[PDB]
């Protein structure tokens, strides 16, 4: 979301998703441990 507030600041997508998980009230270790499952679920949803 940095490019919407100012200059675009790069950040790895996994870390960005960790920030988002922290946003919804879920600890980032959950994502950093289930990254494969989250990625597969997102890809499957896009295909659907």
């Amino acid at each position: 979301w940095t490019f919407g507030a100012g200059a675009a600041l790069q950040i790895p997508f996994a870390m960005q998703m960790a920030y988002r998980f922290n946003g919804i009230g879920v600890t980032q270790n959950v994502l950093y441990e289930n990254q494969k499952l989250i990625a597969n679920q997102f890809n499957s949803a896009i295909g659907k």
Partner: protein
């Protein structure tokens, strides 16, 4: 994350950064580096799950106090 003693460490609030030689944990919206201690981070799991984890020692604030306690 950070690998210290076979345990994965994650920042409580902030992000891990490196200037090229050493590692720090800093708030996301303003660069002010801090030494990675047990207070900045929380442990979760081990080192075999996280993708991209990097080893680095995690300082223990209570260790010097324990050393002094042992000494005197």
């Amino acid at each position: 994350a950070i690998c210290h003693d076979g345990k994965a460490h994650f920042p409580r609030e902030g992000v891990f950064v490196s200037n090229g030689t050493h590692w720090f944990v800093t708030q996301r919206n303003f660069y002010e580096p801090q030494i990675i201690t047990t207070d900045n981070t929380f442990v979760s799991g081990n080192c075999d799950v996280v993708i991209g984890i990097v080893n680095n020692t995690v300082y223990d604030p209570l260790q010097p106090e324990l050393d002094s306690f042992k000494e005197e």
